Amino acid sequence: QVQLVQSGAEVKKPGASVKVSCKASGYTFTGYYMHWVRQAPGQGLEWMGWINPNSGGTNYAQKFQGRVTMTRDTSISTAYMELSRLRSDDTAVYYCAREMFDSSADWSPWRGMVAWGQGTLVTVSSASTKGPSVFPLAPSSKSTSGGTAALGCLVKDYFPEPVTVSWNSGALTSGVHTFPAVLQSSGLYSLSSVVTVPSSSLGTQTYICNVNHKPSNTKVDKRVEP
Amino acid sequence: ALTQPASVSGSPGQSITISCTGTSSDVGSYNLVSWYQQHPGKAPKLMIYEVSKRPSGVSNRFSGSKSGNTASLTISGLQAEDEADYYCCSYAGSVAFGGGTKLTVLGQPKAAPSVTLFPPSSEELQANKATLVCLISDFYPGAVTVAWKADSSPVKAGVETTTPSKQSNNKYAASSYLSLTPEQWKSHRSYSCQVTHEGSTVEKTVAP
């Protein structure tokens, strides 16, 4: 299995710079070109350039020449993209993507991108960064079920997207629904995550939501009890 | 820099074709058109490369061709899971994407919302705040109306509601939040979240 794992979301003020990493595994890192592609929220894909992890040569889209530098550390199979003099229309999900065939094949790196990182959201804003407040949502059997109950976590009043929520440190995945956030009139976001569990497990199994808001460097592990 | 329609629709089982037009310097001169499929909240997925070749494991319902300066993605026997955005791409001295095509599959049956309403937590009350949480899932089409009541009277202040958003099963989800003071929450008999979808209404009520 080929895998591209990117660094976590960031927030920046206008004029600063951001550096995103991409750790590759499952293949010979120096044999395939690495591209970087971004996507503003609700908009299309925009190529930024590529690096050859062998030799380290680069090629950049005209739009970003003189603002962007791509590098790699072959000793840890990691590519980097740094974008400077940031502006608010640089707000976007930044992806790394590996070329289709290796660099011996004719027409690499112009054929296509088979393997994609999970994406890194970077928000460029001059507004204040705010961390979430996390409140437990105690189990309720009223909706749902046949012998089940729904419980959750309310994640309130955080600014830059995104927030991630896992349950029991990733050991609980079936029945988890994390809802898209609302943007409130205050300019802050709020979301909820709910998991449906067996009712008979309530007195014996502990449920914890793991809330991660990387833009404020905040993690909350909130136990949800009856 | 390439031109494709912003949104197309077809019916299940039928075939549909999405066009991607460049110039004679790119699409017209090279056999280096690729196509990508992107579901909500996921990375793009490479569906076609070199105009007409399919990566391993991509369904043979997807095919590609080119004529003059226009490349074409064709999907046979459309299914509900084919709803997504589709991007074309071509060498052009650089990597050049089209603007993207949103594909909708008509004929999907109505699905009624499932509603969960949570009262404010004891922890939040101790922090001198109160939030009611109305979570709405599995509805289609993606249009919903949400209305809150304190006892029997309407409440419009402190209400925040998302636009419907597509989930993985092609049905939609939405959230509404009612912010109150602790004093307000404890001074009424009940509060209700009332969800209306395609003329039918679900109301859930909680009380202190």
Residue numbers in the entry:
A (entry chain H): 1 to 52, 52A, 53 to 82, 82A, 82B, 82C, 83 to 96, 101 to 226
B (entry chain L): 3 to 9, 11 to 27, 27A, 27B, 27C, 28 to 208
Task: Quote the study that presented this structure, word for word.
Crystal structures of a natively glycosylated HIV-1 soluble Env trimer derived from the clade A BG505 strain (BG505 SOSIP.664) complexed with the antibody IOMA, revealed that this CD4bs bNAb exhibits distinct properties from VRC01-class bNAbs. In common with VRC01-class bNAbs, IOMA is derived from the VH1–2 immunoglobulin heavy chain (HC) gene segment, and it binds Env with a similar overall pose as other VH1–2–derived CD4bs bNAbs, but it is not as potent or broad as many of the VRC01-class antibodies. However, unlike VRC01-class bNAbs, IOMA includes a normal-length (8 residues) CDRL3 (34) and is less mutated with 9.5% HC and 7% light chain (LC) nucleotide mutations to its iGL compared to VRC01 with 30% HC and 19% LC nucleotide mutations. In addition, IOMA accommodates the N276gp120 glycan, a roadblock for raising VRC01-class bNAbs, using a relatively easy-to-achieve mechanism involving a short helical CDRL1, and four amino acid changes (including a single mutated glycine) that each require single nucleotide substitutions.
